[model samples]
Target: PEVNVVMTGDMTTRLAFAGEQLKQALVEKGYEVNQTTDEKEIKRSIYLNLLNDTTKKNKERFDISTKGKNTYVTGYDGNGIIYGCRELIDQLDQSGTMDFKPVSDAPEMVLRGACIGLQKTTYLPGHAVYEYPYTPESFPWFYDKERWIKYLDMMVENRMNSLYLWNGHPFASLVKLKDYPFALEVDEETFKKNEEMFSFLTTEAEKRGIFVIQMFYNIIVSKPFADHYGIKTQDRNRPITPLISDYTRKSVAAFIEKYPNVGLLVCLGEAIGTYEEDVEWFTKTIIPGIKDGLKVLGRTDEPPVLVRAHDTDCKMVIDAALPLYKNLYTMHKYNGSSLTTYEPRGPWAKIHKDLSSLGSVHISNVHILANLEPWRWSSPDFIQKSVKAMHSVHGANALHIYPQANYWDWPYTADKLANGEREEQVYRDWAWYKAWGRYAWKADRNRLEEIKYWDKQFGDFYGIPAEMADNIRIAYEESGEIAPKLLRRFGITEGNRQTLLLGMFMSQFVNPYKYTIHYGFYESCGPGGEKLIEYVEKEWKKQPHVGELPLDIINQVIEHGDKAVAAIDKVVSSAKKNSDELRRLQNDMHCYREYAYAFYYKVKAAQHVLNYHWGKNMDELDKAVPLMEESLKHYTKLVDLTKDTYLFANSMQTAQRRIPIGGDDGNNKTWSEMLVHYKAELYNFKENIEMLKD
Candidate 1:
C-alpha cells in the first residue's frame, strides 16, 4: 500500500499538522507517503485542495474524488482539509488500497465534544454524600499532560471539535485578584507553570481544530478570601451576601481577562446551591461581570458561554440570562443512568424549547460516562440511536459527553455524534472506532462492507490475534449488559435509593449510599405480612418497563451473566501471552460476573423472605437463610475484588447515611457490626421458623 500524499494547498500550520498526522499514519501502516506540493510529480498522489464552497456551510465539510491514479480531497476550510485527509488515510488503512469513490460529508452537530472532570474535591464543598463514596483525592490522571495530548488526538481523529475541562472553580488558579486571596494558593512560579500547561493544551487543541472550554462553579472564592472576609462557606440553605457577590464578580472579571481564549461554562447552583437568590446573583452579578470584563478588555466579540444546568431551574435561569449574551448555549444530562441504560430528555429541554422561540438556541446533549469503563462498554447501537434521537430534536446543536475515566469509546460515540448511524454494525471490536470514522466520513462506499482494517494493525496494537477482536467484542457487549440490566431488575427509580446502588456498583470510588433491605423489611407473618407481600409484588411489577416481569428479568440476568463469563474465558484463553490489556479486561469481566451473581442471590433471598412472610412456611425460611448467606458471600467476593480500587470500608447502613466532610462522629458501623446485624436477622428467621413448626 505505497501511497504518495501531495499537499497542494495554501498550507497553514493547521493544514501542515493534519498532513503530518496523515503521513505518520501512512508510515506506520507500511505505506510510503511521499508528501509533496509539486504539481509536475504525480504517482498515485492524494492531492489535497482547499475550496471555498458557499453551499458547504460546515467548515469541516469535505469532498473526495479519484481521477486516474490521483485522488483529490477538497475541503471548505483547514479543518475540512484535515478531516478529508483523515478520511483518505482511513480508506488506505481499511482496504490496503486507495480505491475510494467520490464522497461528500459534514458533521450532524455544530460542536461535538467531551467534558473531562478535573475536580480536586470529591463531593462539592458544601454537598453531603448520602449513598455514594466520596474520594476527593481520586483521579490523578487529570494532571497528566501526555494523556491530554492523546485525548486531543482522539478528538481530532473522531472529528470532535471541542474539549471542556470540568473542574471546581478553575478561575481560582487561573485568575489573580488584589483583594481576594486564593483559597489554595500556589507560588508565583507554580502558578505560571500551571498557566503554561493550560496554554499548551489550548494551543495543541487549536492546531487540531478543537476548541477548549472551561466549566466551573461560579461564586466560589479562594479559601483565603472566604476566611479573611468572614464569608460563610457554601451551604445549600445559605444565601449569597453582597460581600460574596462583589468577590464573585471580581474573580469572574479577572478570569475572563486572563484566559480569554478559553470559553466559559458557568454553573449556577452546583456547589453553591440552587435557589431563586442564586439565579438572581448569576443573572445580575455574574453575567454583568463577564460582559464588563469583555468590554474592559476591548474584546466585544462574545465567546460561546455554555451554561451548565445542575440544580438550578433550567428555564428560569436561561430565560433571565439569555438577554445578557449573544452566543449563549445550555447543557444538561439527558441519560439519567451513569451506566448508559436509558435515554431521556435533557434536564433543560423545556428551557431549550422556550429560548428557541427567541433565536436559534444551542442545546448540548450531555451524556455521562462518569465512572463507567468506556473501553469495555462500547454500546454502538445505543450510541447511534441516542445521537440520532437527539439530532431529531430542534435546536440540538452539540453532544457533550462527560467521560470521567481516562478510557473512552471516542471513535464510536464521537462518530455517531458527528454523523448518523452505519448499517449492520451491531457489535464492539478494536476496529469499531475506525469503522465509525470511515462510515462517518463517507470513506466506505458500501454500507454492508466490513472494514477489517485492524486485522493487520492488531499485531502491533495489543499484540493479540485478529480473531480475539471478535472475542473482546463479545465480552465488551456482554460486560456492558450485566450492570445496567441488573440495576433495572434491582427495581430502583431514577434518583432513588436503587439508582444510587447502580452508581456505587459502576463507580470506582466509594459510593455515598449503602445498600440495605430495611426499607422493605417486614416483621410478622399474618394479614399484615400478606399485605406487605402484596405491596412488594406491586412495587416489583411497577419497576420493569412494558412487557417485562421480575422473574423473566432475573432469568435474563443469569443468562447474560453466564454468557459474559463464557466470553471472558474465550478472551482470556486467546490472550494467554499476558498483557496489561488482558489483565484489565479480565478483572473487569470478573467484577461484572460477581456483580451479576450478587444481584441474583440478593434478589432470590429477598423473594424467599417475602414468600416466608406471606405463607408463614418454615420451608421458605429454610430457603431464605442459606440464600441470604450465599448472597453475602458473593457481595464480599465482589468487594474483595474491587477493595484496592474502591472505598468499601463502611457498612450498608452507615454508607447510606448522608454525612458531610469533617462531620464523621465515629458512629458508623464496622465490618463486624454488619456481620452481627446479618446474623441477628438470620437468628430472627430461625426463631420464627421454630415457632411455626411448634
Candidate 2:
C-alpha cells in the first residue's frame, strides 16, 4: 500500500524541517510513497489522481470508476488527500496484509482548512535567574531527571505549548546561538557549557514537539549594564541585571543556526534598574543589530520580533522599536483588581487602544497575554467567568492562565509557612518549661483533626458550575474506556485531574489565629511577643460576643467559620473518589491532617483550663495552668511527628528530580528548611510543658 504526503506552506526553514520529518516518519513505516511537498506544486489536482488509482486497484470488488475526475473528489485539497491516503495505509498495516480488499471511502463533510489559533502562556514553575551553573553539584534540587521529565510532560499535557526562557544571567542561561538571532560573547568554557545544555533541551523538546520561544532579555538592564544603570542590588551575587550586551549579535547568530523554529523575545525596559538612556539603545542599537544579524543569518522569512509589554514607558519603548523592525508586539493585561478595574473599560481596553495607535501594527499580529492571579482563593467558576469575560471584552489574541502550582505568591507558602522562623522560636522557648512540654502531644492531635477535616472537604463542595461538573463526569467516564491522550480535551489525565489537589490541602493550615499563636509563643521571651499578643487580642476582639462578647464580633466569627467549613466540605467531597491513587493521596494527606487535629485539640483543652481559672480562686488558676501544660505537652509530640512526615515527603519529592543530576525543576528549598526549624520548636514545647507540670 502506498502512503501519500502533501505539504504546502511559505518556504521557510521551519516548514522545510517539518516536511522532512513527515517524510522520514512515512519512509520508516515501510510504505510506498507518493509525495508533493513543494510550496509551488501542492495545490494541483492531486486528490483526483489518488482516488483514480485507488478505484482501479479495487475494480474486482465493485464498480468504482469516477464519473468525472474533478466532480467526484470535490472540495478536497492535496493535503486532505494525503491524510486520507495515510489513514488508508494505517488501517492496512493494522490488518498486517497488503492483499486486503480495498474499501470505498468518501468525504463525510466538505474539506476546508483545519483551523488553528495560537495562545501565549506564561512560563510555569518560574524561578529566579540562576547565577551559577544549574549543575547537580551547585544546585542539588535540579538533579532529578525522571521527575523533571514528568513535570515537563505535564506542561505539554496541559496544552502549555510556549515557554518564555528568560535567563538573566549571561553565563548561566543556555540557548542555541544558531537558533537565537541576537549576538553575545562569553568565555569559551562558559559558552561551551551553555551549548551542551541547550543541545540537551533542544533534543528533548523536539521529540515532544514542544515549541521553544527563547526570551533574551527578562528586563532591559543586562548584567554588565546593571552597575552602569544604578539598579539597586537585591542579592550581592545577583549583580547581573537586564543589560544589553556587546555580544548580542554574536549570540543571536549562534542561536539561529541550531534552533531555526525559535521565537525571539524583545524585553521592554519597565523593570527597575533599566536606565532611561538604555531604552533607546535597545531600540536603536540592539533592534537594528538583531534585524541585521537575522538577515545575515538568512532568516529573512521569519516573523517580526516579539516584545514584552511593560508597565511604565511601554508606549515610548514600543514606538521607538516598532519603526526599527516589523515587530509583533505583546503586552500583559494583568488581572489584579487594583490595576484592572479602574482603567478605561478595564486594563485590556486601555492597552488595546495604546497598541492600536502603533499604525503599522497588525491587530491580529498583536498578541495580548492575560495575567490572571495564580491562587487568590478564587473559585474555578470565578476564573472561568473572568477569563471568558476578558476574552469577549478585549478580543485577546491569546490567553495565558497562570497557576500558583509552585509560584510563591500563592497562599500555600504565604499564610502557612511564611513566619516559620518566628513560630519555631516560640516552640523552642515554651518547650523549655515543663508546663508547655506536658500538653504538647494533646494539642498536636486536635490540630491534626481540624486540618484533616479542612483538607478533605475542599474537593466536594467547591462551587463548580453545572457545565464544568458535566465535563468532569464525562471526562472521568471517557478515561475509564479511552486512554488519557484521547480524553485530554476533557482535562482528565492518566494521573487524576487532582494531581495538584494537595495545594488546597496545604493552604488550610494558614488560619491567622493558629499562625499568630505559633509565631507568638516562638517569640514570647522578647518585646516582639507583645506585638504578636496584640495581634491575637485584636483577632479575639474581632470574634463576636460568645455570651458577653459583642454581637458584631460573634457574627463575624460565625460568618468566617461557616465559609471555612464550606470550603473544606467542598474539597473533601470531590476528592473522595475511592480510587487506589486517591487512596494513596489521602494517605499522604492524612499525615498533615493528623498534625492539625492534634494542635487544635490541645489548644481547645488549654482554652477550657484558662476559662475555668477566670473568676475562680487563686488555687483554681494554679490548677488550670497545670492542665494547660498537659495539653501543650501533647501538642509538642504531634509537631515532632508532623516534622518527620514533612522531612520524608521532602526527601521523596526531591529524589524525583535529582537522581540523574542537573534536573531543571525550579522550586525553592524554603519548605524543606522550615521543617527542620519546626522540629526544633516541638522540642522546646516539650520542655515548657514540663516546667508547668507541677
Candidate 3:
C-alpha cells in the first residue's frame, strides 16, 4: 500500500493546490504516498513543469507524457499545469491506474466560470420583496471560510477559471469612507470580518486558477449612507446623484486598493440613469475609481472590468469605457434564467452584435437554471448542445453558467438527511457539475466517447457495475429533458414562475383572445409553440401556422414525459441497492418520474379545461375533471415523496415567485405549500363547472 510520490516544481499557490490534489487522490486510492519537491528525493513521481511555450495557444493548456519510468505533466501556465495534473488525477480516478497514453489537451472555450449571488444567503435589500433584502444575520456561511474553501476546490477540479460573486452593495459591506465614515454600515468588527472574508475568498480563488470577479448593482449605497443622504436604497426613478456617485467611486477605489487581484462586473441598475449618465458613470466614476486604486499599487495594465448587458444600454456603456479601460468585458444572459431554447433570440443576437462590433470579450451567460432547478438536469447532449450554442454567438468567447441550485442553500438540496442534518446537494448532483465543466472545457466532444467517459464516471461515483451505471446514466440524461422540454412547449412563463410548486392554473391554458372570448388564457406562452387561440383562429380561416399547435404541444409534452418516466422507472427497478448513494439516486429519479407524469396530466387537463371553456359543453367539463384529477394525483404523490424529507424545492426568492411575473414559493416554501395551491386549482375548476351548470 506504500507509494512514494514527489512534486518537483516551484510551490506557487496553484502548484501547491494542485500538488495536494495529486497527493490526496493517491491517498484516497488507499496508497501511502510520500511527496517531495526535489527530483533527486523521489521514488515514483509526477514532475510538473511550467513551460514558456513557443507554440500551443492558451496559457491554460497542457500535455501529459511518461518519460523514463516517471510521468511528466507540463503546461504553458500555472492553470495549464493545474489542468494537466487534474487530467492525470482524473485518469487515475477512472481507470484505477496511471498506465495511460500521452495526451495534449486544450479548451475551445477560454473563460469557463459560474455566477454566485448573495441571495438565499446574503440579504441585500432589493427593490422588491423578492429581491431578498439584506439583513445582518442573512448568511453565516458568507463568513464560513471553510464552506467557500470546498466551493473553490470544486471549481478548480472542474478546470474553471472565473468566479462572479454578486451583491446589491458589496462596497457598503466591505469599505469605510475616509471622508464619510458614517457611510460605514457596520461596526469596525463587521467591516474587518468583511475584509478578512474577501481577502480569504480572493486569495483562495487565485490559488485555484480562478478570478474572483465582484459584481455590484450600481448607484446603490449602504443603508446608512442612503439614510444620511435622505434617499431610498433602491429606486427605479432615482437619479444618479453626485453624492451617490462620489460615495460609490470612493468605495470601489478602496475595494480595488485592498483586493487588487479582484475585478469588477458593475451594472447600472437598482437605480435609474440615462445613456449619457450610464456612459458617464462608467467612464468618469468607475474607471477613475479603479485607476486610483491601481495608482496606489502602480500597476500599469488595467485588469478586466465587465459591463453587464442586463438592464443597461450595453453599447453606450462599453463604448465609453473602452477608451478609459483597455481590458473590458461584456456579459449578457443567453436565455434570461430559462434554458427554453438554444437557438439565438434576435435581441440577444443584436446585443452580441453590438458588443462584439465594439471589440470586447463577450461572455454569454447560461444564466440561472431556474427552469429546472430542484430537479437535476444532467443530460449530456443538452449540455453539449448548450455549450455549442454558447460557442455559436459570433462575439462571445467566455461563459458564466449558474449553479443548478441557489448558493445560499447550495450545499444541500432542500432535502433533510435521516440523521436530521441536511443531505449533501453537491454530492448528490456532482455529475451535473462534471457534465457542465467537461463540456465547457471541450465543447466538440464526440457524442459516443462522452458517453463512455460518463460510463466510467457514473460507475466510479455510484460504486456500481458498468451496466447498472450506464442504466442509471440513461435514466439521468433521459429524465433531465422533461422540465426544459415542458418549459419550452407548455410553460406559462419563465423560471421565476416556479411550475414545480405553484403548478399550472386552468386560466393559463389559452391565450388572451381565447381567455377573452372563452374566459381563461394566461399572458405568456412558451417558445416554439402557439396559443390555443392562435391555433383555433388560424384553423377557422384555414390559415397556415408556423409553430406547433396547442393540442400537438400537449401530445409532445406527454410523449416527452413518458420517455423520462419510463427511463427513470427502469433504473429504479434494475438498480441494485447497495449504498445510500444509490438510494439517493432512487429518491431523485422517483421524484423526477412522478413529476413527468404530473406534467403529462397537467397539459392534458389544460386541453379539456380549455375545451369546456371554449364551448360550455358539459361533456367537455366531465372529461376535464378526471384529466385534472390525474394531474393532481401525481403531484400529490410528488408531494408525498418529498414533504417530510425536504424543506424546500427550487425555492430561490426570484421574481419568478412573484404572482404576476411567476408566482409564490419565492418565499422558499415547501412542496406542501404548492400542494395547497394544486388543491385550489382543482377545486376552483370543478366548482366553476357546477357554477356554469347553474
Candidate 4:
C-alpha cells in the first residue's frame, strides 16, 4: 500500500524534520511514501496540520484521525506536530496499516532527565574500566559526535526532557580560566574540537526540546597546569579558596557565554574537601562567582545552580544556600536502597515543602550503575509506584534519573521511569518505549487495548510460537525474582559496595592468622586498609547486614536461578533471533548462581569462626575450614564467570577486597593472600584442640 503525507498550515524546521523521519521509516518498511506541503495535494493522504496554539502551555499535545484513505493529524505546536508524526510511524511499525481510530495525547511530568558520566578513568586498575587509556581523544563513546546524536534521538523517543553530563571536574578540560593560567590549557585545536562538540550536543538537544545540563565537582586546575605555573600556596596540596573561587567565577562566566543554553550543577564536597568550614566558603565565594557570571551575561532569570546532597545534610545546605540565589534547585540521591523505600514525603520533601517559596527540590533517583554493577533488572511495579509517589509530593516536579556506568539494560528502566509504562509484551520486551511515549501524553489513559496490539506486533516480529513466547516470559519473570535477591545477598549497597563484596568473598578462605594482605583486609596494613575498615563498618549497619543472608534466601535464589537458566536455555537453543541477548541472560544467571553460593559459604564460615573464637569449640573450628574452603571455591567460579561476561568485574574485585573478621585487622587477607592465612587458621584450630586435649 502507498502512503502520502501532506503538511498543511505553517511550515517549520521541526515539522520538516519530523516528516523526514516518517519518510525514512516508511521507505525502510517497503511503503511508497510521498510528502507535500501543497494544500491542494492533500487528497487520499495523511494530512498533518502544524498549528500554533498560544493557549497550550505544553507544546507536545496532538490529535490524530483517519477517514476514507485520508488520515488527519493536528498539532498544538511544532513539538506536537513532530510527536504526532512519530505516533504515525509507531502505528505503521506495530501494524501493517495505520488503520487506527482517532487518538490524542500530552506529558505527565515537566522534566524527565538522565545523567551520563563522561570520564573514563577508574580508581582501581584492571577493574571497572569504563574506557581504557583515559584521554579525551581516546574515549570513543564520549568523543563520538555521531553516537551522541543517536543518543539524543533515543532520549527524545523515550520522552526524556533533559540530559545531564557528569564528571569529577570537566571545566579543566572544557574551559580556560582567563584569570588563572594555572588551570589546564588544551591545545588550540583540541579546545576548538571540544567546544564544537559541546555546541553540537546542546544545539541538537534544544531542537528536540531537551535541556543540556553540565555537572562537576571541586574545581581544581590540572596538575600539569599548576606545575607549569608554579602556583604555590601555604597549603600547597589544596588550592587556595580565594584563588580557586576567582578561577571558578571566570571559568563559569566563560563557559556560560560559550554555551548559553547549558545548565550547571555543582558539587561542593568529596573531591573538593569536606571540612565544615569549606561549606560556607563554597556557598559564599564559589556560588556567588557563578551567579555573578550569569548576571554579567544578562541572564537575570534563576541561576541554573544544582547542588548535590548525597553526603551532606540536605536541610542545612538548603538553608544556607536558599537565600543566596533566587532560583536555586537541590537534588538528593538515594544511594543504594531499592526504589520501594523512596519516600516522597521524606526529609527532603519536608524541607522543600517548608521552603517551597525558597526554591525547587527533587529526588535524584539512581536506578542502576550507582554502586555495585548488577544485571539489568528493575521491578516495573517499584518504578511506577515511585513515580506516582514523586508526582504526589508537595513540591516535587521532576524525577531525575541517574543511569550511569553500565548501559546494557538501562533503556528498559529509563523508559519505565519517564513514561510510567510497563513492558509486559513487545519484541525484545522493549515495548515500554512506546508505552512511555503514549503515557507521557495521556497519563491516566488505560493501556489494555494498546497492550493487545503490542503483544501481537512483538509476537509477529520474533516469529515465535505462543508457547515459546510464554517460555521467554517465564525466563524473564524468573530473572526478576532472582536478580534482586542476588543483588541484596551480595551486599550491593551505596558507596563502593562492589569493592567491599569483592574483598569479602574473594578473601573468604584466606588464613585467619595472616598479618598482612595487599587488598586492604586489615586496618593497619594493605591498600586502602583504613578506608576499607570504615566502609565495611558503616555498610554493615544497613538493613540485612553483611553475613545476614538466611539459608532460605540462598535456597530461594538457587531455585529461581535454576528456573531462569532452564527457561533461557530452552529459548536460546531454538531461537534464531536475539541469540546474543539470550546467551547474556544465561551468563548473568550463572554469575548470580555462583555469587549466591559464595555468599552462603562465606557467611556460614564467618558464623563458624565466631563460635570457635568464643568457646574454642573443636566442632565449630572444624566446620569453619571446610565452609571457608567452599566459599573460596565458589569465589573462583564467580570470578571466572564475571571476568568473561561482566564489564566491571575488576571494579567488583577491587571493592570486595576484604572479608569481615571479628578480631583485630591483622586477620584480614586479600583474595590471593587467603591461602596462607587459611593454613595458619587451621594450624591454630589444631593447636587449640591439642591444648584442650591436654
Q: TM-scores for all candidates?
A: 0.77, 0.43, 0.89, 0.75
- Cα lDDT of all candidates, in order? 0.55, 0.33, 0.69, 0.54
For lDDT, candidate 1 versus 4, the one ahead is 1
The TM-score between candidate 3 and the true structure equals 0.89
lDDT of 3 by residue, 90-134 (tens): 888767876756889877677888877666632344333213322
Candidate with more favorable, higher TM-score: 1 or 2: 1
**Residue-pair clashes per candidate, as listed?**
12, 130, 7, 17
Which candidate has the top score in TM-score?
Answer: 3
lDDT-based ranking:
3, 1, 4, 2
* Residue-by-residue lDDT tens digits, candidate 1, 34-107: 78766566556777777655563666888898888877888888788888887877676656666777778777
For each of the candidates, the C-alpha root-mean-square deviation to the true structure, in angstroms, is: 8.6, 17.2, 3.9, 8.6
lDDT of 1 at 221: 56
Question: Which has the higher TM-score value, candidate number 3 or candidate number 4?
Answer: 3
Give the residue spans of candidate 3 off by over 4 A: 1-11, 30-43, 53-56, 121-136, 393-395, 407-410, 495-501, 512-527, 569-578, 609-618, 653-656, 659-668, 691-694
Q: Model 4: per-residue lDDT, tens digit, 1-694?
A: 6778887877776677777777888788887887877655552588878887756365578789878787888878777777787788777777667675677875666556777656432332321222122246544455677768777777767667778876555666677775665565456667677877888888778777678988766544455444665753112136346655666667777777777778887766544444454466457766676776677788777645776664455557667776776556766543232322323444444444543434464644443333223444433333444455455543545556654323223222211212344221122224333333333334443445533444353345445654565555555445555434433333323333233323343233223234233321121111111122222334344432342234445577667667766765665566566566556656766665665566667656656655554556778767766876776677677666655444332222322323332212222313334334544554665586577668
Q: What are the runs in model 2 whose C-alpha is more than 4 Å off?
A: 1-160, 171-193, 203-209, 218-260, 269-275, 336-349, 356-383, 401-403, 407-694
What is model 2's C-alpha RMSD? 17.2
lDDT of 3 at 79: 88
